[PDB]
Amino acid sequence: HWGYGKHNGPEHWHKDFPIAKGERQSPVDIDTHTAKYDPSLKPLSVSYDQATSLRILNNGHSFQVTFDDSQDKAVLKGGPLDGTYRLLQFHFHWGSLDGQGSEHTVDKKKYAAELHLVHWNTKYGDVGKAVQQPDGLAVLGIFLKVGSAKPGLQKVVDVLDSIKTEGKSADFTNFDPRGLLPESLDYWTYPGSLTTPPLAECVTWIVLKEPISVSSEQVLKFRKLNFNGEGEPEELMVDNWRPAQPLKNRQIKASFK
């Protein structure tokens, strides 16, 4: 099926997911001089104090940490959003080299990686219903640059050896995702899509201006994961990012001057 290689990557996806060429696809380049400050945008409310992590999983395209979303334990509100969005999972996209790996870009600049915290609108009852709605999901995107280590990331990095190949999972309870955020919650926002198939146009994107720093040793451990399942020819999980898509009839708004 679909992937990130030459024969199944982003340029092929439209043949099975024709919405790949749609009117509100993600990611996009964020042109900082064209984004407009919107004084009506409220501060984001990230309420992760009661988060309950469950498992960490290599899904063949990234690794993800999943959460109990059966109650309002870890929620995102405010910002551009109406109502309450529950945290379902987080995952990353990264490169083979430090100069590439992010999905969104800022004035064409690519970061080494990008963290996505995926939330769904509780008014739709479950995530499967939410992905069929134009305001069903909210993804909080955070850029990673290489510099000093991120201490809140280390517990993730230390377990990646146990989920090297596609399909492997491990217990990952008591993880606090608040340790993955930067200091500032200043953000850009625009309406978009999932960045992997099915590419559904159901996402309010919230992309933080301030990157987090991670160490070279931390990102190197991302790059030792495998796209393949156990026993298959080893293909390193690197460059699992979709490039920027046409902005079309959309305006990116900034929460800050």
Ligand X SMILES: CC(C)NC[C@H](O)COc1ccc(S(N)(=O)=O)cc1
> Is residue 138 classed as helix, strand or coil in its secondary structure?
strand
| Residue nearest to ligand X as judged by C-beta position | 2
Q: What's the rounded Cα separation, in Å, for the pair 204 and 73?
A: 20
**Cβ–Cβ under 8 Å, residues 86 and 119:** yes
How long, in residues, is the chain?
A: 257
Tell me which stretch binds Zn ion (CB under 5 A): 94-102, 111-119, 143-151, 212-220.
111-119
**97: CB partners within 8 A, 6+ apart:** none
Work out how close the CB of 140 gets to Zn ion at its nearest, in angstroms, rounded to a whole number.
11
Is 104 labeled as catalytic in the residue annotation?
no
What Rg do the C-alpha atoms of the chain give, in angstroms?
A: 17
Cα–Cα separations (whole angstroms), residue 65 to 53, 56, 68, 146: 7, 4, 11, 22
DSSP 69-121: -SSSSSEEEETT--S-EEEEEEEEEE-SSTT---SSEETTBPPSEEEEEEEEE
| Closer CB to ligand X, 6 or 33, in the complex | 6
Is 93 a known ligand-binding residue?
Answer: yes
DSSP 55-71: EEEE-SS-EEEEE--SS
| Closer CB to Zn ion, 86 or 116, in the complex | 116
Work out how close the CB of 218 gets to ligand X at its nearest, in angstroms, rounded to a whole number.
20
Is 12 a known ligand-binding residue?
Answer: no
Is 32 a known ligand-binding residue?
Answer: no
Which residues contribute to the site for ligand X (CB under 6 A)? Answer: 1-2, 7-8, 12-13, 15-16, 116, 118, 127-128, 131, 139, 194-196
Work out how close the CB of 241 gets to ligand X at its nearest, in angstroms, rounded to a whole number.
9
The neighbour count for residue 159, using CB atoms within 10 Å, is 17
| Closer CB to ligand X, 8 or 184, in the complex | 8
x-or-dash string of contact with Zn ion, 127-166, rule CB under 5 A = ----------------------------------------
Does the protein bind Zn ion through residue 119 (CB under 5 A)?
A: no
Q: Return phi, psi of residue 235, to 5°.
A: -125, 115
Is 204 a known ligand-binding residue?
Answer: no
Catalytic residue among 1, 61, 104, 119: 61
| Residue nearest to Zn ion as judged by C-beta position | 116
Does the protein bind Zn ion through residue 116 (CB under 5 A)?
A: yes
Work out how close the CB of 200 gets to Zn ion at its nearest, in angstroms, rounded to a whole number.
13
| Closer CB to ligand X, 136 or 211, in the complex | 136
**Cβ–Cβ under 8 Å, residues 180 and 150:** yes
Is 196 a known ligand-binding residue?
Answer: yes
Work out how close the CB of 167 gets to ligand X at its nearest, in angstroms, rounded to a whole number.
15
Binding positions for Zn ion, rule: CB under 5 A? 116
Active-site residue set = 61
Residues flagged as binding site: 91, 93, 116, 195-196
